[PDB]
Structure 1
């Protein structure tokens, strides 16, 4: 099976909503070792965000249940949570490894470097959500440093209305809010990202949607 057919199979999986197949297709595209196109980079990202998104959402349900029980029901919920966590960990480590071996080193443009550093940020951030252990501090710091370098390249190299730059601001601010527990820094990062895009006002739809999500977070975190 060649790159072209793996890519077409991935787009079939996507439309069938079969996100596990889609991810294995894009992973083996990435393991061929050549720099991904935009469309190629997008498909991989969409695939894994659905795969890891489902475990995240199940993790939250089963950990809430485990927190709100006062039996042997508790031990069951705890052991189901742990099983979900280990699937979640294996998926994150798969993605981080593609990132460290082939996506980040091959990225020849700034836009691409920022996309993939953001993504490394996100996937350490998901590990951080379920790694309250003594390994949490080192995970959180891996997340922060990928985002931080993304942030500095995007600020030098991209306009305030670029969707990749706007998206990075959105998720970095979420990271400050939920992982570092620094609401002030979360809010001021999101606020300036929003005001700088507004000032620069583009060739649109995806930018203005992330602007809305920035401001919704600002509205939530301020009450």
Structure 2
């Protein structure tokens, strides 16, 4: 249909809380090939966040069950086959997103803010795939995650102010990637510390978009508190 109808359909699906519709709509808006405005970008991001978060949350519950069972092998095999089905639904969702990123969003993005956003998004979606990868495949999924956050990180150092929510959000996600996926808590802490400190200094760089920057800085410092004790 028309790129407008599609967007309108999405905001309906979103109102209905039908997030798989919403992601189908926004996927096809993106496949039309034109650079996505902020409103479209955001609608895309919302839809897939809900669609994947459900699977992730489902995966966390079932995997922790398959692990906390040590009685009957029958129950444990049932739980494994279910964790497997879910992982499958999950690889699929990420792989769609990762390809929408490669084919359309990253190469069409004309402004650094938006480049940074979609690189971050690529880092997040490889992160997800990594939590669920095997011993063989995994060293390499992790690396694709790191390369993307790294690239996002460098553009945002060169091109955005240290208080921009998208820059801070990247720092927050990249630091959690260091702590939790790569086990480098030294790297995690300094990245988060640095980011907090740079935002603190150029504090006059704030604006109507501050409550958000300071909430994000609060979350970065919270991680520091938690990770050092």
Q: Which runs of 4+ in 1 moved over 2 A?
A: none
Distance, in Å, in 1 between the alignment partners of 2:85 and 2:151 is: 33
Quote the Cα distance in structure 1 between the aligned partners of 2:139 and 2:53. 23
Where structure 1 has 5 or more consecutive residues not aligned to the other structure, the ranges are none
- Deviation of 1:198 after TM superposition, in Å, equals 1.4
Q: How far has the Cα of 1:96 moved from its partner?
A: 0.3
Q: Distance in 1 between matches of 2:178 and 2:13?
A: 35
Distance in 2 separating the partners of 1:32 and 1:180: 37
- Which residue does the alignment assign to 1:113? 115
Q: Deviations over 1:109-138 (max 9, x none)?
A: 111111110000000000000003301011
**Structure 2 unpaired stretches of 5+:** 203-208
Report how far residue 147 of structure 1 moved. Answer: 0.4
Distance 2:220 2:11 in 1: 30
Q: Map Cα deviations across residues 88-127 of structure 1 (whole Å, 9 max, x no partner).
A: 0000000000000000110111111111100000000000
Residue of structure 2 equivalent to 1:29: 29
Please name the residue that 1:204 is paired with: 210
Number of aligned residues: 221
Q: Please give the alpha-carbon distance, in whole angstroms, between the structure 2 residues aligned to 1:15 and 1:214.
A: 31
Partner of 2:227 in structure 1? 221
Offset at residue 150 of structure 1 (A): 0.3
Cα-to-partner distance string for 1:170-221 (whole Å, 9 max, x where unaligned): 0000110111011111111111111111111xx5122112111111111221
Which stretch of structure 1 is more off in the superposition, 91-100 or 206-215? 206-215
How far did 1:148 drift?
A: 0.2
Which shows bigger deviation, 190-199 or 26-35? 190-199
Residue 222 of structure 1, CA deviation:
1.7
After TM superposition, give the deviation of residue 9 of structure 1 in Å: 1.1
Q: Deviations over 1:120-165 (max 9, x none)?
A: 0000000000003301011000000000000000000000000110
Distance 2:104 2:62 in 1: 34
Q: Could you tell me how far apart the structure 1 residues matched to 2:148 and 2:7 are?
A: 28
Displacement of 1:36 = 0.2
CA distance in 2, matches of 1:168, 1:98: 20
Give the superposition deviation at 1:85. Answer: 0.2
Distance in 1 of aligned mates of 2:214 and 2:66: 39
SS at 2:162's partner residue?
A: coil
Corresponding residue SS for 1:33: coil
- TM alignment of 1:42-61, pairs within 5 A: 42-61=42-61
What's the RMSD between the two structures over aligned residues? 0.9
In structure 2, C-alpha distance between the alignment counterparts of 1:123 and 1:28, rounded to whole Å: 19
Shift of 1:33: 0.2
